[PDB]
Design a protein around this ligand. Structure first.
Ligand code: MG
Ligand code: ZN
Lengths: 136, 99, 65, 46, 96, 63, 193, 244, 100, 249
């Protein structure tokens, strides 16, 4: 549950605990993202917040262009690498974790997203689908 | 300012055909669209308004739109007929073919 | 907006079709509601209520004088 | 969020029940009684 | 003190005691209200679990994100050989 | 309520005329009518919409 | 009831497709169990004295008694339970050949998984196909019951129409739905000829 | 001819629809207000088939085609393809593509006579798009925007390149597509013009948030309205110089 | 309802079973069961494994090529559904299976 | 910010403000304490109480210091308008008194948190906490008139018309009853009284209207009179400032 996402999101297995690194998936120039918080995360004692494919998350640029460093920005995950049960009835997982930084409104920053994008993320963020050159 | 015009010109400067010796590219407007009447919400005779058809069927929250019956077929009698899609494996779509 | 607009709308019809009767009934009920708050109140709120009542009484006496 | 015991949602559900929500259970009980009478006749026949 | 961190309590106090069931066959604690106008029909049916199995079916849930789309769902098959009546047990209301 | 008989006012736009032998029944009916339409989460000064009592006269009128 | 004495009652006469039904059943047993599992209590960090898989404290200095709410370790499972709101997906019959046949799959195959249900025999009679898990394991008795109220929720009111009924053996990583499909995919075996 | 419209909540009309001169498509999800919003203008004169692409609501970016045919991603289920075929007239060819770039709507954009495609697309996809649509194919990029489909709305009357395109790139795109082109924006300045609105020879749906000058520039470049055959941009020189 | 032959052993992959690795190359690697997926994770060659069906097709056994297999192609043609064509296909499938 | 600062924190009279602050301090902070409690416990209790009261007063003052327009360095048009309306000098003096009371409450809370640590008895800490609360109340007691003036200007400043001087505009002017209000009513959807009496509009009015695919905002003004630039009310001066600061015909 988060503002700027088209439609409600169905539950899927989490695989991005806060502080997890993930490779950059767009041409913004950042080399990798370091998650620090997950918008909409369920608060609970002793429970570390975690994200999933297509979720928005704040993340610092652990590596990449220096100008993007030393600041946290919202980011939408484009890959999870953890198995999740699609409603169609087949498990799948991405080769590696990935994501893209984006504005809180959800508009894409980079001109295009590199690599395959999960169907769950493209269905949730129309701008990500417009910027995604390969859906699954 | 003598500066803003250089940037606005990129939008104001409409392109030209640049013949590239032409092949015919006349617009394809169907005649049925030309014969279609304009929709008037105030008109009592206005089209059934599938939106209104959903509103009279309990609204958007309960109406069950039927993708069937709006698609063309050789005969309407089987328009509701279910497709197998499978037969002892090797789904029927792989085997379906004319002749 | 951008003006005393609410006063203009009050001048147009004014606050309700029947704003006056309910206000008069509330002003009549206040005479009993004051005693009800004086009796039914509990905790520190009753001390502040009695203090404000004594202050209003002293002010009314000074005004009459 | 509204409580499950909240009177407003319960009254709205009670108002919704009068229509198809009750007609479906009525037709279901009728079909069940018909199937039961058919099963009884199938046993009495033999 | 206040524990410094409020948390939901573990378990469910309403299911206690968590003792073993008195019998393998759980007994019904309540039955649907008797609408006498309706035709007579059994309020319950005994059965035997057999095993869960995968199932897939197109949804008809308008307004759902998955409307008009296949959705796999588990189902619990239950062997239910037909039941045969063997008697009756009446009841009468009493203050107790 | 039992006894009271609702009837829209003749030749009087946007009005309803409750009437009944007992003051209690007609009064409770008018109270429930004015209360069921109460505005919520909106300033009363701008939203004048809502049912309101207009008269409480006898059926006779003029006797 | 007097007319029905010695008469069998088929499930079709008590239930029908898309009907919701409660399914009370005893839970699977587990024996004695620690608080970490019977109640989900968090484990102690590591190698704590006097054990780690137990609540670190039972109560305060007062009252000088252990409260019933402290969730002491005890027997787990074998508890009575009353699940509700479980729609029926398919009301089969034992006389209906190819009970797993559907308008789409329409295969000539029984719903029973190849080799039989695990720790259970092959079905040979009418069977409900209620969706979702139910309390208890295989061979447990279950008492199907009405919802007790006119719910008719849109999740319940909606019609169901199965597209395919899996029958691959649960005994292992089953792939083929029927033995003939296995013999076809594998071909003739050395024992066959 | 322009008609403001909205999806569930989004100005990206192109992500949820793929308008064409002989047919149109819309996501089956949500209420009918979107499909009825398309019916209010197009009417019954052309089919408006409800459809899904692997169940996604983003089918407009997942597919591309013209009046002569249509294409769908390899991931599409056979049921959706059979529905799209039985609903559409037989004249509209359909053919599943096997190429790695499933996002055909962004990977490809086309009109009745031309079709730009992604530079990295395999030659087999180019030959298939040619054999199906009948249009000449020419891989290109919009001033470094490799996703030509999302950044360049196109129609036989004209197109709309994204605002950052260089004037030389606009002249090259006009020399290639043989159609008028103009830099601009849609959906309140959004840089993604290809996904922000659908358009055809006689209709151009767009989001409610689009600015009036943007709607005027769209109707002018597409010549969608009478007395605006793209020649009125000179009359707009005051409105355009004032807007910026 | 789109069953897939296993990427490793070519066995059918019914819905709700198996795993589907998603490589960065963006082409699915479906696996009917955990065994084939773990074998793919080890970069084992299915052709070199005796139990793989591809090894049987490469060994010159089990009629690796036959006219009956021509019907197995994953046709992209959307040719319109027809009840008579559907019945003829339902008969032809069993006939081709018996001949095969 | 600018453009109709409706986000002001709804300032309240100093009596009600001190009452709400003392109530929040009595309710949120722990209350019960006993003579037998360790002296460090009573000291930490009174310190937490004084710190809570001081932080609440500091927040109540900072919300007003931050939510107000800050007339200076906003725009010459809005600056002259607010000066003609709220007596800019008094408007600055009021917020300066607010900041002075905030700094005084801060210094008091700090000095009493420092002095409180040395208290050797529960009665001494109690008298020190009472002295801190009374100093904060006396500082609030002198703020009554400025707080009421801020509450009045907030009720007036929050209903001022939205306007961006950089945006296109067209001022209207004329003698009273000329029909300029009727001209604004006809040229745009904005409602304005058209009563015969001379000054039907005591304040500026605005009304957007589209033209040539471009937005425009007609701005009626509250009349003008032929006076020697000194015998004039704030209304006429506010009108003259609207013309002087606004270009475009
Ligand atoms: Mg006037
Ligand atoms: Zn395999």
């Amino acid at each position: 549950s988060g503002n700027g996402a088209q439609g409600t999101k169905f539950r899927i297995s989490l695989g991005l605990p806060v502080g997890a690194i993930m490779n950059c998936a767009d041409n913004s120039g950042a080399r990798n993202l370091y998650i620090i918080a997950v918008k909409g995360s369920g608060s609970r004692l002793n429970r570390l917040p975690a994200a999933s494919l297509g979720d928005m998350v704040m993340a610092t640029v652990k590596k990449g262009k220096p100008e993007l460093r030393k600041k946290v920005m919202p980011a939408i995950v484009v890959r999870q690498a953890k198995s999740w049960r699609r409603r169609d009835g087949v498990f799948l997982y991405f080769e590696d974790n990935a994501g893209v930084i984006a504005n809180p409104k959800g508009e894409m920053k980079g001109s295009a997203i590199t690599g395959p994008v999960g169907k769950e993320c493209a269905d949730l963020w129309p701008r990500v689908a417009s910027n995604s050159g390969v859906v699954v | 300012s003598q500066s803003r015009i250089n940037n606005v010109l990129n939008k104001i400067h409409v392109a030209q055909p640049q013949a590239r010796d032409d092949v015919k590219r006349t617009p394809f407007i169907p005649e049925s669209v030309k014969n279609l009447k304009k929709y008037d919400p105030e008109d009592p005779n206005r089209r059934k308004l599938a939106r209104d058809i959903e509103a009279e069927n309990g609204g958007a929250g309960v109406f069950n739109v039927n993708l069937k019956d709006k698609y063309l077929l050789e005969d309407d009698e089987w328009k509701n007929d279910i497709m197998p899609e499978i037969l002892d494996g090797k789904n029927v779509y792989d085997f379906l073919d004319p002749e | 907006p951008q003006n005393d607009y609410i006063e203009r709308h009050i001048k147009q019809h004014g606050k309700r079709l029947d704003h006056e009767e309910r206000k008069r009934k509330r002003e009549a009920r206040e005479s009993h509601k004051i005693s009800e708050r004086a009796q039914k109140l509990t905790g520190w709120k009753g001390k502040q209520f009695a203090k404000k009542r004594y202050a209003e009484k002293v002010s009314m006496r000074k005004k009459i004088k | 969020a509204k409580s499950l015991r909240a009177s407003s949602h319960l009254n709205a559900k009670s108002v919704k029940r009068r229509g198809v929500f009750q007609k479906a259970v009525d037709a279901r009980e009728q079909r069940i009684s018909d199937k039961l009478k058919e099963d009884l006749l199938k046993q009495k026949l033999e | 003190s206040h524990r410094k961190y409020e948390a939901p309590r573990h378990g469910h106090l309403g299911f206690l005691p968590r003792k073993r069931a008195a019998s393998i066959r759980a007994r019904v604690k309540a039955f649907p209200k008797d609408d006498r106008s309706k035709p007579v029909a059994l309020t319950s049916f005994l059965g035997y679990k057999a095993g869960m199995t995968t199932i897939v079916r197109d949804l008809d849930r308008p307004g759902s994100k998955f409307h008009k789309r296949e959705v796999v769902e588990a189902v619990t098959v239950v062997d239910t050989p037909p039941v045969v009546v063997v008697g009756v047990v009446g009841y009468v209301e009493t203050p107790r | 309520r039992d006894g009271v008989t609702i009837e829209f006012s003749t030749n009087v736009k946007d009005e309803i005329v409750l009437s009944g032998n007992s003051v209690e029944d007609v009064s409770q009916n008018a109270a429930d009518l004015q209360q069921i339409c109460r505005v919520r989460n909106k300033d009363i000064r701008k939203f004048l919409d809502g049912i309101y009592v207009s008269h409480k006269g006898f059926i006779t009128e003029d006797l | 009831a007097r007319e029905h004495f010695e008469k069998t009652v088929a499930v079709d006469s008590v239930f029908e497709q898309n009907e919701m039904i409660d399914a009370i059943a005893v839970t699977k047993g587990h024996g004695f169990e620690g608080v970490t599992h019977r109640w989900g209590t968090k484990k102690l960090p590591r190698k704590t004295h006097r054990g780690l898989r137990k609540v670190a404290c039972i109560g305060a200095w007062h009252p000088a008694h252990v409260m019933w709410s402290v969730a002491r370790a005890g027997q787990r499972g074998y508890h009575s339970r009353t699940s509700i709101n479980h729609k029926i997906y398919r009301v089969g019959k034992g006389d209906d050949e190819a009970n797993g046949a559907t308008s789409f799959d329409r295969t000539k195959k029984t719903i029973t998984p190849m080799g039989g249900f695990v720790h259970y025999g092959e079905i040979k009679n009418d069977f409900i196909m209620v969706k979702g898990c139910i309390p208890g394991n295989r061979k447990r008795i279950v008492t199907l019951r009405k919802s007790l109220y006119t719910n008719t929720s849109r999740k319940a009111l909606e019609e169901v129409s199965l597209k395919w009924i899996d029958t691959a053996s649960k005994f292992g990583k089953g792939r083929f739905q029927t033995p003939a499909e296995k013999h076809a995919f594998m071909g003739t075996l050395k024992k066959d000829l | 001819m322009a008609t403001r419209t909205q999806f569930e909540n989004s100005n990206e009309i192109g992500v949820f629809s793929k308008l064409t001169n002989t047919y149109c498509l819309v996501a089956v999800g949500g209420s009918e207000n979107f499909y009825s919003a398309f019916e209010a203008e197009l009417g019954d004169a052309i089919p408006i088939v409800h459809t899904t692409i692997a169940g996604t609501r983003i089918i407009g970016r997942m597919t591309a085609g013209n009046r002569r045919g249509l294409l769908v991603p390899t991931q599409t289920t056979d049921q959706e393809l059979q529905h799209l075929r039985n609903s559409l007239p037989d004249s509209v060819k359909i053919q599943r593509v096997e190429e790695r770039l499933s996002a055909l709507g962004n990977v490809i954009c086309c009109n009745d006579y031309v079709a730009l495609v992604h530079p990295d697309i395999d030659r087999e996809t180019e030959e298939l798009i040619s054999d199906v649509l009948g249009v000449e194919v020419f891989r290109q990029t919009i001033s470094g925007n490799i996703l030509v489909g999302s950044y360049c709305s196109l129609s036989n009357q004209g197109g709309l390149v994204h605002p950052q395109t260089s004037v030389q790139d606009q002249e090259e795109l006009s020399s290639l597509l043989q159609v008028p082109l103009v830099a601009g924006t849609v959906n309140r300045g959004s840089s993604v013009v290809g996904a922000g609105m659908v358009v055809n020879d006689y209709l151009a749906v767009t989001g409610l948030d689009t600015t009036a000058p943007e709607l005027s520039v769209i109707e002018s470049i597409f010549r969608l309205q009478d007395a605006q055959p793209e020649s009125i941009s000179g009359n707009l020189r005051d409105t355009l110089i004032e807007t910026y | 309802m789109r069953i897939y032959q296993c990427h490793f052993c070519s066995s059918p992959c019914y819905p709700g079973h198996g795993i589907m690795f998603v490589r960065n190359d963006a082409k699915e690697f479906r696996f009917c069961r955990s065994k084939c997926h773990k074998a793919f994770k080890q970069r084992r060659n299915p052709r070199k494994l005796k139990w793989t069906k591809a090894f049987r097709k490469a060994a010159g056994k089990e009629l690796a090529v036959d006219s009956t297999l021509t019907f197995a192609q994953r046709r992209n043609v959307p040719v319109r559904y027809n009840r008579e064509l559907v019945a003829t296909t339902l008969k032809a499938m069993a006939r081709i299976e018996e001949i095969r | 910010m600018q453009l109709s600062w409706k986000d002001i924190p709804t300032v309240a009279p100093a009596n009600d403000l001190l009452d709400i602050v003392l109530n929040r301090t009595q309710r949120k902070t722990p209350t019960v304490i006993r003579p037998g409690f360790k002296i460090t416990r009573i000291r930490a209790f009174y310190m937490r109480k004084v710190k809570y009261t001081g932080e609440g007063f500091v927040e109540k003052f900072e919300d007003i210091l931050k939510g107000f327009p800050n007339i200076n360095d906003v725009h010459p048009f809005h600056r002259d308008l607010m000066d003609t309306l709220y007596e800019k000098n008094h408007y600055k003096i009021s917020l300066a008194a607010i900041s002075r009371a905030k700094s005084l409450v801060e210094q008091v809370a700090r000095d009493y948190v420092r002095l409180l640590k040395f208290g050797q008895s529960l009665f001494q800490c109690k008298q020190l906490k009472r002295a801190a609360l009374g100093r904060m109340a006396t500082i609030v007691k002198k703020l009554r008139d400025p707080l009421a003036y801020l509450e009045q200007v907030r009720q007036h400043i929050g209903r001022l018309p939205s306007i961006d001087p950089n945006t296109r505009t067209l001022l209207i002017c004329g003698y009273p009853n000329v029909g300029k209000s009727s001209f604004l009513r006809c040229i745009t959807k904005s409602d304005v009284d058209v009563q015969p009496y001379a000054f039907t509009t005591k304040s500026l009015y605005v009304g957007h209207f589209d033209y040539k695919y471009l937005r425009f905002q007609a701005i009626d003004t509250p009349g003008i009179l032929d006076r020697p630039t000194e015998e004039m009310n704030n209304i006429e001066m506010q009108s003259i400032y609207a013309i002087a600061h606004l270009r475009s015909c």
